[PDB]
């Protein structure tokens, strides 16, 4: 004889604001042979799961902003 | 004889704001042979799970901002 | 005979704000042979699980900001 | 003046046999509320990325093999 | 004047056999509230990244093999 | 004047057999509230990154093998 029993019985102006956010990312990269041969320049690779937030400014997440030149 | 029993019985201006955030990232990178041969330049690689937040400024997460030149 | 029994019975201006944050990151990098041969330049690699927050300033997480030159 | 240069110049009976194998699986399960209320039975749930290989035997990966009864 | 330069110049019966193997698995499970209320039975949950290999035997990875009964 | 330079110039019966193996597993489980209320039974949960290999035997990785009964 086996017997079992269970018996159970306000302005919020910017309030909850989730932004510039990255969450829940599962990334497998098995074999990526990255051979980056750069001469005289700018290179950006492999930016994953990145966040930024600015106020009163100029923001670039991954910018290949190559050259400035000025002669006078 | 086996017997078992269980018996159970306000302005919030910026209040809860999650931003410039990265959470919950599972990343396997098995074999990435990174051979970065740079000559005379800027290179950025491999930026993962990164966060920034600025106020009154200019912010770049991963920027390949190569060169400035000025002659007078 | 086996018997068992269990018997159970306010302005908040910036209040709780989580930002420029990184949490909960599980990262396996098995074999990444990083051979970084740099000559005359700037290189950045391998920035993982990084955070920054500025106020009244200019902030770059991983910036390859290569060169400045000025002649007069 | 900026100058840069780069200069580059036997039976095998069971030999390499990959079997009963699982590789390269990226799985996000955000919110699965698993409420498994079992009474008097067998239940199996949530078998992911599993492998088995037998020789001279009887193998079940995830088998809900409920009951045997014998009276004499 | 900036100058840079780089200058570069046998039976194998069971030989290499990868089996009953699991590799390279990135798994995020954010919120799975597992409430397993079992009474008088067998339950199995949450088997991830598991391996087995047998020889001359009977093998079950995750088997809900409920009951045996014999009366005489 | 900036100058830089770089100058570079047999039976194998069971030989290399990787089996019953688990490698390279990145697993984030943020919030899994596991409430396992068992009465009179067998329960198994949460088996991750597990390996076994037998020879001349009967092996179960995670088996909910509930009950045996024999009366005479």
From Swiss-Prot, chains A, B, C, D, E, F:
Phenotype when changing residue 23 to Q: In PARK1; no effect on protein structure; no effect on phosphorylation of the protein; no effect on membrane- and lipid-binding; increases oligomerization; increases fibril formation; increases secretion of the protein; impairs copper-binding
Residues the record lists as Phosphoserine modifications: 60
Localization in the cell: Cytoplasm; Membrane; Nucleus; Synapse
Residues at which Cu cation binds: 23
Highest taxon of the lineage: Eukaryota
Main location: cytoplasm
Sequence-type repeats, residues: 15-29, 30-40
Keywords tagged on the record: Acetylation, Alzheimer disease, Amyloid, Cell projection, Copper, Cytoplasm, Disease variant, Membrane, Metal-binding, Neurodegeneration, Nucleus, Parkinson disease, Parkinsonism, Phosphoprotein, Repeat, Secreted, Synapse, Ubl conjugation
Annotated stretches, region: 4 X 11 AA tandem repeats of [EGS]-K-T-K-[EQ]-[GQ]-V-X(4): 7-40
GO cellular component, one term: synaptic vesicle membrane
GO molecular function: actin binding; alpha-tubulin binding; beta-tubulin binding; calcium ion binding; copper ion binding; cuprous ion binding; cysteine-type endopeptidase inhibitor activity; dynein complex binding
Reported effect, residue 19 to K: In PARK1 and DLB; significant increase in binding to negatively charged phospholipid liposomes; increases oligomerization
A GO biological process held by the record: microglial cell activation
Tissues of expression: Highly expressed in presynaptic terminals in the central nervous system. Expressed principally in brain.
Post-translational modification: Phosphorylated, predominantly on serine residues. Phosphorylation by CK1 appears to occur on residues distinct from the residue phosphorylated by other kinases.
Function: Neuronal protein that plays several roles in synaptic activity such as regulation of synaptic vesicle trafficking and subsequent neurotransmitter release. Participates as a monomer in synaptic vesicle exocytosis by enhancing vesicle priming, fusion and dilation of exocytotic fusion pores. Mechanistically, acts by increasing local Ca(2+) release from microdomains which is essential for the enhancement of ATP-induced exocytosis.
Notes concerning its domains: The 'non A-beta component of Alzheimer disease amyloid plaque' domain (NAC domain) is involved in fibrils formation. The middle hydrophobic region forms the core of the filaments. The C-terminus may regulate aggregation and determine the diameter of the filaments.
Disease tied to this entry: Genetic alterations of SNCA resulting in aberrant polymerization into fibrils, are associated with several neurodegenerative diseases (synucleinopathies). SNCA fibrillar aggregates represent the major non A-beta component of Alzheimer disease amyloid plaque, and a major component of Lewy body inclusions. They are also found within Lewy body (LB)-like intraneuronal inclusions, glial inclusions and axonal spheroids in neurodegeneration with brain iron accumulation type 1. Parkinson disease 1, autosomal dominant: A complex neurodegenerative disorder characterized by bradykinesia, resting tremor, muscular rigidity and postural instability. Additional features are characteristic postural abnormalities, dysautonomia, dystonic cramps, and dementia. The pathology of Parkinson disease involves the loss of dopaminergic neurons in the substantia nigra and the presence of Lewy bodies (intraneuronal accumulations of aggregated proteins), in surviving neurons in various areas of the brain.
Oligomer and partners: Soluble monomer. Homotetramer. A dynamic intracellular population of tetramers and monomers coexists normally and the tetramer plays an essential role in maintaining homeostasis. Interacts with UCHL1. Interacts with phospholipase D and histones. Interacts (via N-terminus) with synphilin-1/SNCAIP; this interaction promotes formation of SNCA inclusions in the cytoplasm. Interacts with CALM1. Interacts with STXBP1; this interaction controls SNCA self-replicating aggregation. Interacts with SNARE components VAMP2 and SNAP25; these interactions allows SNARE complex assembly and integrity.
Similarity comment text for this entry: Belongs to the synuclein family.
Protein name per the record: Alpha-synuclein
Source organism: Homo sapiens (Human)
């Amino acid at each position: 004889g086996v017997v079992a029993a269970a018996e159970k019985t306000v302005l919020y102006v910017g309030s909850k604001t989730k932004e510039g956010v990255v969450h829940g990312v599962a990334t497998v990269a098995e074999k990526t042979k990255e051979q980056v041969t750069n001469v005289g320049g700018a290179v950006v690779t492999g930016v994953t799961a990145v966040a930024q937030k600015t106020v009163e400014g100029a923001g670039s997440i991954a910018a290949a902003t190559g050259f400035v030149k000025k002669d006078q």
